Assembly symmetry: C2
Homo-oligomer: 86 residues x 2
Amino acid sequence: KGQKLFVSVLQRLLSERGLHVKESSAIEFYQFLIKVSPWFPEEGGLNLQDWKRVGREMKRYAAEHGTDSIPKQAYPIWLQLREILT
Amino acid sequence: SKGQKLFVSVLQRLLSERGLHVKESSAIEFYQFLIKVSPWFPEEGGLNLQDWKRVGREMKRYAAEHGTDSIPKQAYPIWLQLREILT
């Protein structure tokens, strides 16, 4: 779980910068997030170290699985959150 | 302490931006208090005004049942600052 919490946080952080995502797009981002990085809800936080780790683990997932089944919004959201955390 | 480091990181960031700073260990105590009073929150709850208003009601139900003592001093102040942010 933590889906509701994380989504509520994401949408706040993004709308603060004028970007808006569908509720269902944010949910699918999060479902994707915890698949690639299952430790994240349990052990991770919104901090640059963890978020860069999430990103390495995604760009590994892209090499080992191809663009197929990677949501089109995942990388752009990951990237926006990286900038917010910089 | 599961879901902790995440919630704690959101809390510190949100307060930071309003010029408020809270020690990590005070924020950790706040969180452990929160899930004790509202164990639904990590699974079912969002950082939104309705869920958060439910949390304060439930903190006050805890204060009624077990008295003011043994409630962290930072708990109502943090709760209140985040209530405002959610408006």
